[PDB]
Design a protein around this motif. Structure first.
Motif, short mmCIF file in Angstrom:
data_model
loop_
_atom_site.label_atom_id
_atom_site.label_comp_id
_atom_site.label_asym_id
_atom_site.label_seq_id
_atom_site.Cartn_x
_atom_site.Cartn_y
_atom_site.Cartn_z
N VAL A 159 0.89 -1.17 0.00
CA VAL A 159 0.00 0.00 0.00
C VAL A 159 0.93 1.21 0.00
N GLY A 160 0.71 2.16 -0.89
CA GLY A 160 1.49 3.40 -0.94
C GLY A 160 2.49 3.34 -2.06
N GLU A 161 2.83 2.17 -2.59
CA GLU A 161 3.86 2.07 -3.65
C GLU A 161 3.22 2.45 -4.99
N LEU A 162 3.99 3.10 -5.83
CA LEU A 162 3.67 3.47 -7.21
C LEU A 162 3.58 2.22 -8.07
N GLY A 163 2.42 1.95 -8.66
CA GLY A 163 2.28 0.76 -9.52
C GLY A 163 2.15 1.17 -10.97
N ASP A 164 2.31 0.22 -11.88
CA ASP A 164 2.11 0.40 -13.32
C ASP A 164 0.86 -0.38 -13.71
N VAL A 165 -0.04 0.24 -14.46
CA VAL A 165 -1.28 -0.49 -14.87
C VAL A 165 -0.94 -1.71 -15.75
N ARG A 166 -0.07 -1.58 -16.74
CA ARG A 166 0.24 -2.66 -17.69
C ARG A 166 0.77 -3.87 -16.87
N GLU A 167 1.66 -3.59 -15.95
CA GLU A 167 2.31 -4.65 -15.13
C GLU A 167 1.22 -5.30 -14.29
N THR A 168 0.36 -4.52 -13.70
CA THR A 168 -0.74 -5.03 -12.83
C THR A 168 -1.67 -5.92 -13.65
N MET A 169 -2.05 -5.47 -14.84
CA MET A 169 -2.94 -6.28 -15.68
C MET A 169 -2.22 -7.57 -16.05
N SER A 170 -0.92 -7.53 -16.30
CA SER A 170 -0.18 -8.75 -16.67
C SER A 170 -0.29 -9.79 -15.54
N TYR A 171 -0.17 -9.37 -14.29
CA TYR A 171 -0.28 -10.31 -13.14
C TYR A 171 -1.67 -10.86 -13.05
N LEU A 172 -2.66 -10.02 -13.28
CA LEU A 172 -4.06 -10.50 -13.16
C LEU A 172 -4.36 -11.47 -14.30
N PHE A 173 -3.90 -11.15 -15.49
CA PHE A 173 -4.10 -12.04 -16.66
C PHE A 173 -3.40 -13.38 -16.47
N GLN A 174 -2.25 -13.38 -15.81
CA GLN A 174 -1.52 -14.63 -15.52
C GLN A 174 -2.38 -15.55 -14.62
#
Ligand code: HE9
Ligand code: HE9
Ligand code: CL
Ligand code: CL
Ligand code: ZN
Ligand code: ZN
Lengths: 315, 315
Positions: A159-174
């Motif tokens: 919580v609080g860390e800067l995330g990337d949407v593309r990277e996040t979607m890649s983990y969810l798609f996995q």
């Protein structure tokens, strides 16, 4: 005088394990790391109000390791402590309904999570881990705290860390069933000739380099090993959506030509995402905030498009 | 008096970017976070010995974001700082050749990494990110520091953290070309009847629940939603290996019946892995240490087997 209470331990919040705890000893002395709805109670002694409550513990016997793996589809030993740490924060976030979708009120740099969650609600996708199935169902109904804490855990973000949407979607798609998805590409070099490639699963629905699904179908310029520029274009697509990604650049979104998109303002060290959805007009969802416009131009990083089956007419 | 040196910046250590730096200002003031072969020099002013050297920086323009994505296949903004932090440690680890394989001398809880690296050298697998291709090639020749630092970065583990072999292999397989791999399963419930499932890619080569490839082919007991026990068995397998995993349990490894295995001694909070390889006899590789035996029994957590094509004779 020895005093005890009954409590339950769990890894999945479904399968309960009866325990008798000594009220003279910490939870930690008895179970190891222990959590009560996200709160770390490892260093706390049992309270009378705890009688009959469920505590999360770490998978510290073979029964729990099987229950944890079957529910979450991970054997990372720090997973449950990361899920619990995030949940202690996400349960205090607000999840307003914005234009019919569960969003998240801005807190703790969560803009990337809000745009990811809004996106999931606009694309056809089913998760494989029961934990994500169950939490995503809750999130669609408006109680997204578990779902957001699981995304943080699966992505290895705090919580609080800067995330990337593309990277996040890649983990969810996995963790989604994309096994039906298939992409055929052709790369043409005037020196080296043609090379076709087939992609499957996550790599069939994600592309990094261009935002435009039409440009991808006509061809995009990429390096060749020989030193010339080759042309890469889409031969065949079978999937219910595609995601086109690029470093953030001023880009025009036209009503009716895409499903939704992510906009990023800032730099590599800090920034802010917003979500644009194409419905009866263009809505810009920014956590709890909503605005509308007939036209949109902004630093777009991801665009999602509807698909079923595409076949090129390039011979 | 203004003094400058020439240096190069990079994200991939191949593509260099010429820079002129002021020796009166930190690297951080000029480039942002900066690293010299893993060492964080963000807060250091340029030295004369730095002239002509390569520094890693974060992808802070569109050229670097494209170079970083193409080399590493991630857009996690903390990736390069995690890779650099790990590399500052892994470059000081020792990588002895043990029975013809690159191993790692024990340091910083790296046993899970040693057994993963030894395993990769015994199974047919090609990575997709150039970063892993290039580093794995170096690791096979004995210079595994980059490869180990990239595994730590891709897995979101820091040097010193307790890792799980199954979880580590899952991350590496997610960055490998396993698109040819296919698994067909049948689940038989005396109440609910039969249900067949097809798995692809990573989920075609990994199974969690049993160590025995023969037992998987005859059938393993699993819960059904109706409350009975169902039988799950292997109908069809196309892959060059399979990985069978289970919570650690005393298990007998017989020469000639498997490729290699991981043994785990300890508990959920701390432990030690060793590697067992089946060659002319059973070799137990424990970092730099090697022993041999005709028979092996130990708390085994993962077993790897050779495959090409299997079809059940169960009707
Ligand atoms: C990534 O792990 C898995 O895919 C997985 C694990 C257990 C299951 O029961 C299952 O259906 C899938
Ligand atoms: C996960 O990302 C990719 O699979 C990927 C990205 C860039 C490429 O040039 C490529 O061949 C594959
Ligand atoms: Cl789902
Ligand atoms: Cl490779
Ligand atoms: Zn060429
Ligand atoms: Zn049944």
């Amino acid at each position: 005088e020895v005093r005890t209470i009954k409590v339950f331990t769990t890894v999945d919040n479904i399968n309960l394990h009866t325990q008798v705890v000594d009220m003279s000893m910490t939870y930690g002395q008895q179970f190891g790391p222990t959590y009560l709805d996200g709160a770390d109670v490892t260093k706390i002694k049992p309270h009378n109000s705890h009688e009959g409550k469920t505590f999360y513990v770490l998978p510290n016997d073979d029964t729990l390791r099987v229950e944890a793996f079957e529910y979450y589809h991970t054997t990372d030993p720090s997973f449950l402590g990361r899920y619990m740490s995030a949940l202690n924060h996400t349960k205090k976030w607000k999840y307003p309904q914005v234009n019919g979708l569960t969003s998240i009120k801005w807190a703790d740099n969560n803009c990337y999570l809000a745009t990811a969650l809004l996106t999931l609600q606009q694309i056809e996708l089913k998760f494989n881990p029961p934990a994500l199935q169950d939490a995503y169902y809750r999130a669609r109904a408006g109680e997204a705290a578990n779902f957001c804490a699981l995304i943080l855990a699966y992505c290895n973000k705090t919580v609080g860390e800067l995330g990337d949407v593309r990277e996040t979607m890649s983990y969810l798609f996995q963790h989604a069933n994309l096994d039906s998805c298939k992409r055929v590409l052709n790369v043409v070099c005037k020196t080296c000739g043609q090379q076709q490639t087939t992609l499957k699963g996550v790599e069939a629905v994600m592309y990094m380099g261009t935002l435009s699904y039409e440009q991808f179908k006509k061809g995009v310029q990429i390096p060749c090993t020989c030193g010339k520029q080759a042309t890469k274009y889409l031969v065949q697509q079978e999937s219910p959506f595609v995601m086109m990604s690029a470093p953030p650049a001023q880009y025009e979104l036209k009503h009716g030509t895409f499903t939704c998109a992510s906009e990023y303002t800032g730099n590599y060290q800090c920034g802010h995402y917003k979500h644009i959805t194409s419905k009866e007009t263009l809505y810009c969802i920014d956590g709890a905030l909503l605005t509308k416009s007939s036209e949109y131009k902004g630093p777009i990083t991801d665009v999602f498009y509807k698909e079923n089956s595409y076949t090129t007419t390039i011979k």
